[PDB]
Amino acid sequence: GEELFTGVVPILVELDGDVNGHKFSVSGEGEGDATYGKLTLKFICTTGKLPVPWPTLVTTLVQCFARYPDHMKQHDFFKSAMPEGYVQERTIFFKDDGNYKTRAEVKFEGDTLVNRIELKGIDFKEDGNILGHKLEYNAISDNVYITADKQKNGIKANFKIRHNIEDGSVQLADHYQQNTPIGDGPVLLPDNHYLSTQSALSKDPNEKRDHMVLLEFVTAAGI
């Protein structure tokens, strides 16, 4: 499956969301180059205004583009599941606020790597940091800690994202993740390791729709 990632691969992302009954959709396009762990993406809210802050969607909106060091390549579950792909599920607990539950299918459609997502958010506070849009449009960076899940023939992960709040404080988002192959072929069940991930958020000065530009680097480490 790793052979499918040796060059630059087009990416498409499609998300339908419902957070406390606020419905929305997001589409994204860009490119990934796993040789360098490099992702360039642009997302648009296709339904109008996004009802949650963009930074809170970054993690949900393709870890198959991680750069695995040569000495770690037998620990890359993500690429091993391709082209058939994998289901990626999360619960994201926003401290003192609501939660997102996400289910996504990541697979090739031809030469394009597609991430199709449903997101459901509940128990958010109307005037909290998410629905109240109190988070800075700021980068996120952290380590995704992966372990094998032999019983789903896949992986689990956990990590924290600390989103800056406009008052100088932090909104914690505790992520719990599980990935399961879609196909029935052999996949790589890894030893414990992590993905060092950094996402830089920006705006396209010519884009009038509600949107997010991302430049992201993802590198496997810890072995």
Side-chain angles (χ1 to χ4, degrees), residues 1 4-125 128-149 153-177 179-223:
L4 280 57
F5 294 91
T6 53
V8 178
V9 174
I11 301 166
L12 293 174
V13 183
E14 297 292 322
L15 177 148
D16 296 315
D18 174 332
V19 177
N20 274 46
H22 294 100
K23 299 173 179 196
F24 61 96
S25 302
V26 169
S27 59
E29 303 184 10
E31 292 186 322
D33 193 359
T35 301
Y36 305 97
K38 182 177 182 177
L39 285 158
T40 54
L41 294 157
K42 180 180 169 182
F43 301 98
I44 303 161
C45 179
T46 62
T47 47
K49 189 180 175 20
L50 196 72
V52 298
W54 281 105
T56 74
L57 295 183
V58 170
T59 62
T60 294
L61 293 164
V62 291
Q63 292 171 321
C64 52
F65 289 102
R67 185 179 69 82
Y68 273 72
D70 181 73
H71 78 277
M72 291 182 60
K73 284 176 182 295
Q74 303 302 313
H75 299 286
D76 184 357
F77 163 81
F78 309 97
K79 299 182 187 53
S80 81
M82 298 293 163
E84 302 96 331
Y86 53 80
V87 176
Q88 179 161 299
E89 290 168 273
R90 296 211 182 94
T91 305
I92 305 169
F93 296 101
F94 297 86
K95 184 176 177 58
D96 300 309
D97 210 336
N99 63 87
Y100 300 160
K101 280 174 172 297
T102 67
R103 188 181 186 287
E105 295 184 11
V106 184
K107 69 181 57 194
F108 277 89
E109 292 290 357
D111 300 321
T112 303
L113 188 287
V114 180
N115 185 15
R116 289 171 178 97
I117 313 142
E118 294 196 354
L119 176 154
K120 186 66 164 293
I122 66 172
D123 286 340
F124 285 89
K125 299 179 187 168
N129 293 320
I130 285 83
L131 290 175
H133 295 280
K134 309 185 190 181
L135 301 181
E136 297 186 343
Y137 192 77
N138 274 179
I140 59 164
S141 171
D142 224 293
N143 293 330
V144 175
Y145 294 99
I146 295 171
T147 201
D149 187 358
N153 200 32
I155 62 167
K156 290 186 186 323
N158 78 89
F159 55 103
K160 291 172 182 281
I161 299 300
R162 294 177 213 272
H163 296 289
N164 292 333
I165 307 167
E166 64 195 4
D167 69 356
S169 189
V170 32
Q171 173 66 66
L172 179 63
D174 282 295
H175 286 63
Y176 298 91
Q177 176 178 335
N179 298 60
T180 64
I182 294 170
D184 195 45
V187 295
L188 296 174
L189 300 184
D191 289 321
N192 296 2
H193 70 286
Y194 64 95
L195 307 179
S196 174
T197 309
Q198 58 178 307
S199 306
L201 287 58
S202 63
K203 297 292 191 182
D204 175 349
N206 295 318
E207 178 58 69
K208 308 301 187 297
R209 296 167 291 178
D210 197 0
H211 75 284
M212 173 172 71
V213 178
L214 291 186
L215 173 59
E216 180 169 300
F217 295 91
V218 185
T219 310
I223 297 178

Short mmCIF file of all heavy atoms in Angstrom, two decimals, residues 131-181, unseen atoms left out:
data_model
loop_
_atom_site.label_atom_id
_atom_site.label_comp_id
_atom_site.label_asym_id
_atom_site.label_seq_id
_atom_site.Cartn_x
_atom_site.Cartn_y
_atom_site.Cartn_z
N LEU A 131 -19.24 26.99 20.45
CA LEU A 131 -20.38 27.66 19.81
C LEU A 131 -20.31 29.17 19.91
O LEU A 131 -20.91 29.86 19.08
CB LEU A 131 -21.71 27.11 20.36
CG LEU A 131 -22.04 25.67 19.94
CD1 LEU A 131 -23.31 25.23 20.64
CD2 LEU A 131 -22.16 25.43 18.44
N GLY A 132 -19.60 29.68 20.90
CA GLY A 132 -19.38 31.11 20.99
C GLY A 132 -18.21 31.67 20.21
O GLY A 132 -17.90 32.86 20.29
N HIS A 133 -17.48 30.83 19.47
CA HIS A 133 -16.38 31.27 18.64
C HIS A 133 -15.37 32.09 19.42
O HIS A 133 -15.10 33.23 19.06
CB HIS A 133 -16.87 32.02 17.43
CG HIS A 133 -17.67 31.20 16.46
ND1 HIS A 133 -17.07 30.37 15.56
CD2 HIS A 133 -18.99 31.15 16.23
CE1 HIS A 133 -18.01 29.81 14.81
NE2 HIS A 133 -19.19 30.26 15.21
N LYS A 134 -14.81 31.50 20.47
CA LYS A 134 -13.84 32.17 21.31
C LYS A 134 -12.44 31.67 21.15
O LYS A 134 -11.54 32.05 21.92
CB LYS A 134 -14.26 32.11 22.78
CG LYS A 134 -15.68 32.58 23.00
CD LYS A 134 -16.03 32.64 24.48
CE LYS A 134 -17.51 32.87 24.70
NZ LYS A 134 -17.88 32.95 26.12
N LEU A 135 -12.20 30.83 20.16
CA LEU A 135 -10.89 30.25 19.93
C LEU A 135 -10.11 31.05 18.88
O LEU A 135 -10.64 31.47 17.84
CB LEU A 135 -11.02 28.77 19.50
CG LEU A 135 -11.73 27.85 20.50
CD1 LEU A 135 -11.77 26.43 19.98
CD2 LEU A 135 -11.08 27.93 21.91
N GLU A 136 -8.83 31.25 19.13
CA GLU A 136 -7.99 31.91 18.17
C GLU A 136 -7.79 31.06 16.93
O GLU A 136 -7.64 29.81 17.03
CB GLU A 136 -6.65 32.22 18.82
CG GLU A 136 -6.79 33.17 19.99
CD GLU A 136 -5.46 33.59 20.55
OE1 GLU A 136 -4.44 32.93 20.26
OE2 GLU A 136 -5.49 34.59 21.28
N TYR A 137 -7.77 31.71 15.78
CA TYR A 137 -7.47 31.02 14.52
C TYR A 137 -5.99 30.75 14.54
O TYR A 137 -5.21 31.48 13.95
CB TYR A 137 -7.91 31.86 13.34
CG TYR A 137 -7.93 31.16 12.01
CD1 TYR A 137 -8.94 30.28 11.67
CD2 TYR A 137 -6.97 31.44 11.07
CE1 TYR A 137 -8.98 29.66 10.47
CE2 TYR A 137 -6.99 30.83 9.83
CZ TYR A 137 -8.02 29.93 9.53
OH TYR A 137 -8.13 29.29 8.29
N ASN A 138 -5.63 29.67 15.22
CA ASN A 138 -4.22 29.40 15.56
C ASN A 138 -3.87 27.94 15.23
O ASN A 138 -4.70 27.04 15.38
CB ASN A 138 -3.97 29.49 17.07
CG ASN A 138 -3.67 30.89 17.64
OD1 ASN A 138 -3.47 31.00 18.86
ND2 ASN A 138 -3.67 31.92 16.84
N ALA A 139 -2.60 27.76 14.89
CA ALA A 139 -1.98 26.46 14.66
C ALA A 139 -2.24 25.53 15.80
O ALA A 139 -2.43 25.95 16.94
CB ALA A 139 -0.45 26.69 14.52
N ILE A 140 -2.19 24.26 15.50
CA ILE A 140 -2.17 23.21 16.50
C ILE A 140 -1.00 22.28 16.27
O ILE A 140 -0.53 22.14 15.13
CB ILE A 140 -3.48 22.42 16.59
CG1 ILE A 140 -3.84 21.77 15.27
CG2 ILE A 140 -4.60 23.37 17.00
CD1 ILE A 140 -4.90 20.69 15.39
N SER A 141 -0.49 21.69 17.32
CA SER A 141 0.70 20.88 17.20
C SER A 141 0.72 19.97 18.36
O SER A 141 0.46 20.38 19.50
CB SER A 141 1.99 21.71 17.14
OG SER A 141 3.18 20.88 17.24
N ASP A 142 0.99 18.71 18.11
CA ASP A 142 1.01 17.77 19.19
C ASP A 142 1.39 16.37 18.67
O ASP A 142 1.72 16.24 17.47
CB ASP A 142 -0.32 17.77 20.02
CG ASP A 142 -0.03 17.73 21.52
OD1 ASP A 142 0.50 16.67 21.97
OD2 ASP A 142 -0.34 18.76 22.18
N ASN A 143 1.43 15.41 19.57
CA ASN A 143 1.82 14.06 19.27
C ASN A 143 0.63 13.10 19.38
O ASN A 143 -0.07 13.08 20.37
CB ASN A 143 2.90 13.60 20.22
CG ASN A 143 4.21 14.30 20.07
OD1 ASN A 143 4.57 14.75 19.01
ND2 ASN A 143 4.96 14.30 21.15
N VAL A 144 0.44 12.30 18.32
CA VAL A 144 -0.61 11.32 18.24
C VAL A 144 -0.03 9.97 18.69
O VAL A 144 0.79 9.39 18.00
CB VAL A 144 -1.13 11.21 16.83
CG1 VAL A 144 -2.16 10.08 16.71
CG2 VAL A 144 -1.67 12.55 16.32
N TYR A 145 -0.41 9.48 19.88
CA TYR A 145 0.16 8.26 20.45
C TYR A 145 -0.63 7.04 20.00
O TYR A 145 -1.81 6.92 20.34
CB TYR A 145 0.20 8.34 21.96
CG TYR A 145 1.14 9.39 22.40
CD1 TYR A 145 0.69 10.67 22.79
CD2 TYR A 145 2.53 9.17 22.41
CE1 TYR A 145 1.56 11.70 23.17
CE2 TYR A 145 3.41 10.23 22.78
CZ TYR A 145 2.91 11.46 23.14
OH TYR A 145 3.77 12.45 23.49
N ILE A 146 0.02 6.17 19.22
CA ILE A 146 -0.62 5.01 18.56
C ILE A 146 -0.23 3.76 19.26
O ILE A 146 0.92 3.52 19.63
CB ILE A 146 -0.16 4.98 17.09
CG1 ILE A 146 -0.69 6.21 16.35
CG2 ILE A 146 -0.61 3.70 16.39
CD1 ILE A 146 -0.13 6.42 14.94
N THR A 147 -1.21 2.90 19.38
CA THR A 147 -1.01 1.52 19.84
C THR A 147 -1.84 0.55 19.00
O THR A 147 -2.84 0.93 18.39
CB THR A 147 -1.41 1.37 21.32
OG1 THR A 147 -0.79 0.22 21.92
CG2 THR A 147 -2.90 1.17 21.47
N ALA A 148 -1.46 -0.72 18.97
CA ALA A 148 -2.16 -1.73 18.22
C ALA A 148 -3.49 -2.09 18.91
O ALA A 148 -3.61 -2.06 20.15
CB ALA A 148 -1.33 -3.00 18.08
N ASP A 149 -4.46 -2.44 18.09
CA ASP A 149 -5.75 -2.97 18.56
C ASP A 149 -5.99 -4.30 17.82
O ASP A 149 -6.65 -4.34 16.79
CB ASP A 149 -6.87 -1.99 18.22
CG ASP A 149 -8.20 -2.37 18.81
OD1 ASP A 149 -8.34 -3.41 19.46
OD2 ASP A 149 -9.13 -1.54 18.62
N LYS A 150 -5.38 -5.36 18.35
CA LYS A 150 -5.32 -6.67 17.70
C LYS A 150 -6.71 -7.25 17.41
O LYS A 150 -6.90 -7.90 16.38
CB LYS A 150 -4.49 -7.61 18.58
N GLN A 151 -7.69 -6.92 18.27
CA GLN A 151 -9.06 -7.46 18.20
C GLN A 151 -9.94 -6.78 17.11
O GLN A 151 -10.93 -7.37 16.66
CB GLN A 151 -9.73 -7.25 19.56
N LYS A 152 -9.61 -5.55 16.70
CA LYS A 152 -10.26 -4.91 15.53
C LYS A 152 -9.31 -4.95 14.33
O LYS A 152 -9.63 -4.41 13.25
CB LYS A 152 -10.59 -3.45 15.81
N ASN A 153 -8.18 -5.64 14.50
CA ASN A 153 -7.16 -5.67 13.45
C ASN A 153 -6.74 -4.28 12.99
O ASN A 153 -6.61 -4.03 11.79
CB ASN A 153 -7.70 -6.42 12.24
CG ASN A 153 -6.61 -6.93 11.30
OD1 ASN A 153 -5.50 -7.28 11.72
ND2 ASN A 153 -6.96 -7.07 10.05
N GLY A 154 -6.52 -3.42 13.95
CA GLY A 154 -6.27 -2.05 13.67
C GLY A 154 -5.47 -1.38 14.75
O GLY A 154 -4.58 -2.02 15.38
N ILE A 155 -5.77 -0.11 14.99
CA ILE A 155 -5.03 0.74 15.93
C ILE A 155 -5.96 1.56 16.75
O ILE A 155 -7.12 1.81 16.38
CB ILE A 155 -3.96 1.65 15.21
CG1 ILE A 155 -4.61 2.62 14.24
CG2 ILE A 155 -2.86 0.79 14.55
CD1 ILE A 155 -3.76 3.70 13.76
N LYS A 156 -5.46 1.99 17.90
CA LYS A 156 -6.05 3.03 18.70
C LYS A 156 -5.06 4.16 18.80
O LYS A 156 -3.82 3.96 18.67
CB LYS A 156 -6.51 2.56 20.06
CG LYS A 156 -7.70 1.65 20.06
CD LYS A 156 -8.19 1.33 21.50
CE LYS A 156 -9.33 0.27 21.52
NZ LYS A 156 -10.28 0.44 20.37
N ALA A 157 -5.56 5.35 19.07
CA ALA A 157 -4.69 6.47 19.36
C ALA A 157 -5.32 7.36 20.40
O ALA A 157 -6.54 7.41 20.56
CB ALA A 157 -4.29 7.25 18.12
N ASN A 158 -4.49 8.10 21.08
CA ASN A 158 -4.94 9.14 21.98
C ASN A 158 -3.99 10.33 21.91
O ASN A 158 -2.77 10.18 21.72
CB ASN A 158 -5.16 8.59 23.37
CG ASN A 158 -3.96 8.42 24.09
OD1 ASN A 158 -3.51 9.34 24.78
ND2 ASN A 158 -3.47 7.18 24.11
N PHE A 159 -4.52 11.51 22.11
CA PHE A 159 -3.74 12.74 22.14
C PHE A 159 -4.58 13.86 22.66
O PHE A 159 -5.80 13.72 22.78
CB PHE A 159 -3.13 13.08 20.76
CG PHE A 159 -4.12 13.16 19.61
CD1 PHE A 159 -4.53 14.38 19.12
CD2 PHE A 159 -4.55 12.04 18.96
CE1 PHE A 159 -5.36 14.46 18.00
CE2 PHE A 159 -5.37 12.13 17.85
CZ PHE A 159 -5.77 13.36 17.36
N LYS A 160 -3.93 14.96 23.00
CA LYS A 160 -4.55 16.19 23.45
C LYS A 160 -4.22 17.27 22.44
O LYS A 160 -3.10 17.36 21.89
CB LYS A 160 -3.97 16.60 24.80
CG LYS A 160 -4.39 15.65 25.88
CD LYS A 160 -3.65 15.92 27.19
CE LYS A 160 -4.02 14.97 28.26
NZ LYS A 160 -5.33 15.39 28.83
N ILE A 161 -5.18 18.17 22.20
CA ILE A 161 -4.98 19.41 21.48
C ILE A 161 -5.35 20.51 22.48
O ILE A 161 -6.45 20.53 23.05
CB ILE A 161 -5.87 19.49 20.22
CG1 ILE A 161 -5.56 18.37 19.23
CG2 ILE A 161 -5.67 20.84 19.59
CD1 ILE A 161 -4.12 18.36 18.73
N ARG A 162 -4.45 21.45 22.64
CA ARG A 162 -4.72 22.63 23.48
C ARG A 162 -4.98 23.83 22.58
O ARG A 162 -4.04 24.42 22.06
CB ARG A 162 -3.52 22.90 24.40
CG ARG A 162 -3.37 21.74 25.39
CD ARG A 162 -2.19 21.76 26.35
NE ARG A 162 -1.66 20.42 26.68
CZ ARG A 162 -2.09 19.62 27.66
NH1 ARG A 162 -3.11 19.95 28.50
NH2 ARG A 162 -1.48 18.45 27.82
N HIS A 163 -6.27 24.17 22.39
CA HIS A 163 -6.62 25.31 21.57
C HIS A 163 -6.53 26.61 22.36
O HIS A 163 -7.16 26.77 23.41
CB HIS A 163 -8.07 25.18 21.07
CG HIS A 163 -8.32 24.02 20.17
ND1 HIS A 163 -7.84 23.96 18.87
CD2 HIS A 163 -9.12 22.93 20.33
CE1 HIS A 163 -8.29 22.84 18.31
NE2 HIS A 163 -9.08 22.21 19.16
N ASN A 164 -5.84 27.60 21.85
CA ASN A 164 -5.80 28.90 22.53
C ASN A 164 -7.16 29.57 22.47
O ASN A 164 -7.75 29.71 21.38
CB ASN A 164 -4.78 29.80 21.83
CG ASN A 164 -3.36 29.33 22.02
OD1 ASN A 164 -2.98 28.67 23.00
ND2 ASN A 164 -2.51 29.81 21.12
N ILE A 165 -7.56 30.11 23.62
CA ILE A 165 -8.74 30.94 23.74
C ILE A 165 -8.33 32.39 23.61
O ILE A 165 -7.21 32.78 23.96
CB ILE A 165 -9.48 30.68 25.10
CG1 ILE A 165 -9.77 29.18 25.29
CG2 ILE A 165 -10.78 31.50 25.25
CD1 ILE A 165 -10.19 28.77 26.72
N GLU A 166 -9.24 33.25 23.16
CA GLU A 166 -8.96 34.64 22.91
C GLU A 166 -8.57 35.44 24.15
O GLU A 166 -8.00 36.49 24.04
CB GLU A 166 -10.16 35.29 22.20
CG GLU A 166 -11.42 35.32 23.03
CD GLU A 166 -12.69 35.62 22.25
OE1 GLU A 166 -12.67 35.74 20.99
OE2 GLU A 166 -13.71 35.74 22.92
N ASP A 167 -8.86 34.92 25.35
CA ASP A 167 -8.50 35.56 26.60
C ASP A 167 -7.13 35.11 27.11
O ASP A 167 -6.71 35.54 28.19
CB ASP A 167 -9.57 35.30 27.64
CG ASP A 167 -9.66 33.88 28.09
OD1 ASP A 167 -8.94 33.04 27.56
OD2 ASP A 167 -10.50 33.62 29.02
N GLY A 168 -6.40 34.30 26.36
CA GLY A 168 -5.09 33.81 26.78
C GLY A 168 -5.09 32.45 27.41
O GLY A 168 -4.02 31.85 27.60
N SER A 169 -6.28 31.92 27.71
CA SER A 169 -6.39 30.60 28.30
C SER A 169 -6.36 29.52 27.22
O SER A 169 -6.02 29.77 26.05
CB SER A 169 -7.65 30.56 29.19
OG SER A 169 -7.70 29.37 29.95
N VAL A 170 -6.68 28.29 27.63
CA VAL A 170 -6.60 27.09 26.79
C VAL A 170 -7.90 26.31 26.86
O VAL A 170 -8.40 26.04 27.99
CB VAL A 170 -5.35 26.21 27.16
CG1 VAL A 170 -4.96 26.26 28.63
CG2 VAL A 170 -5.49 24.78 26.61
N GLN A 171 -8.40 25.89 25.70
CA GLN A 171 -9.50 24.91 25.60
C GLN A 171 -8.91 23.59 25.17
O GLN A 171 -8.48 23.41 24.03
CB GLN A 171 -10.48 25.39 24.56
CG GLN A 171 -11.57 24.37 24.25
CD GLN A 171 -12.46 24.13 25.42
OE1 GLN A 171 -13.19 25.02 25.84
NE2 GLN A 171 -12.41 22.91 25.96
N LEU A 172 -8.91 22.64 26.11
CA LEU A 172 -8.44 21.32 25.87
C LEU A 172 -9.45 20.47 25.08
O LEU A 172 -10.65 20.54 25.35
CB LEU A 172 -8.11 20.57 27.17
CG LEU A 172 -7.62 19.13 27.14
CD1 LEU A 172 -6.31 18.96 26.43
CD2 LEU A 172 -7.48 18.70 28.57
N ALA A 173 -8.93 19.72 24.11
CA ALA A 173 -9.73 18.77 23.35
C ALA A 173 -9.02 17.42 23.43
O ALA A 173 -7.97 17.20 22.78
CB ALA A 173 -9.87 19.25 21.90
N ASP A 174 -9.52 16.54 24.25
CA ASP A 174 -8.96 15.18 24.45
C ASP A 174 -9.52 14.25 23.38
O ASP A 174 -10.73 14.07 23.26
CB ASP A 174 -9.37 14.63 25.82
CG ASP A 174 -8.57 15.19 26.98
OD1 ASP A 174 -7.34 14.91 26.99
OD2 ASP A 174 -9.19 15.79 27.88
N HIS A 175 -8.61 13.71 22.58
CA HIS A 175 -8.94 12.87 21.45
C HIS A 175 -8.69 11.41 21.75
O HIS A 175 -7.59 11.04 22.17
CB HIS A 175 -8.06 13.25 20.24
CG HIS A 175 -8.39 14.52 19.56
ND1 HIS A 175 -8.32 15.78 20.16
CD2 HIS A 175 -8.74 14.75 18.28
CE1 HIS A 175 -8.61 16.69 19.24
NE2 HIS A 175 -8.86 16.10 18.09
N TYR A 176 -9.68 10.60 21.44
CA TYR A 176 -9.62 9.15 21.46
C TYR A 176 -9.99 8.64 20.07
O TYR A 176 -11.00 9.03 19.53
CB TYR A 176 -10.55 8.58 22.51
CG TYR A 176 -10.15 9.04 23.83
CD1 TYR A 176 -10.69 10.20 24.34
CD2 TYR A 176 -9.16 8.39 24.55
CE1 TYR A 176 -10.32 10.68 25.57
CE2 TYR A 176 -8.77 8.88 25.79
CZ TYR A 176 -9.35 10.05 26.25
OH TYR A 176 -9.00 10.55 27.48
N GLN A 177 -9.17 7.74 19.55
CA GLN A 177 -9.25 7.36 18.14
C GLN A 177 -9.16 5.85 17.97
O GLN A 177 -8.44 5.18 18.71
CB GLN A 177 -8.08 8.07 17.41
CG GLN A 177 -7.94 7.71 15.92
CD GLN A 177 -6.80 8.47 15.27
OE1 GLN A 177 -6.43 9.56 15.75
NE2 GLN A 177 -6.28 7.95 14.17
N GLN A 178 -9.86 5.35 16.96
CA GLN A 178 -9.74 3.94 16.58
C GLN A 178 -9.81 3.86 15.07
O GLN A 178 -10.59 4.57 14.44
CB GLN A 178 -10.80 3.10 17.23
N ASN A 179 -8.97 3.01 14.48
CA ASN A 179 -8.95 2.80 13.04
C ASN A 179 -9.00 1.33 12.76
O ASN A 179 -8.32 0.55 13.41
CB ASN A 179 -7.69 3.32 12.36
CG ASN A 179 -7.48 4.82 12.49
OD1 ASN A 179 -7.36 5.37 13.57
ND2 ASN A 179 -7.37 5.50 11.36
N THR A 180 -9.85 0.96 11.83
CA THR A 180 -10.11 -0.40 11.44
C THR A 180 -10.04 -0.55 9.91
O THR A 180 -10.59 0.30 9.20
CB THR A 180 -11.53 -0.81 11.89
OG1 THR A 180 -12.48 -0.04 11.23
CG2 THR A 180 -11.69 -0.56 13.37
N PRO A 181 -9.40 -1.58 9.38
CA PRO A 181 -9.38 -1.71 7.94
C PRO A 181 -10.75 -1.98 7.34
O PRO A 181 -11.54 -2.68 7.93
CB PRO A 181 -8.42 -2.88 7.68
CG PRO A 181 -8.37 -3.58 8.90
CD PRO A 181 -8.65 -2.68 10.03
#
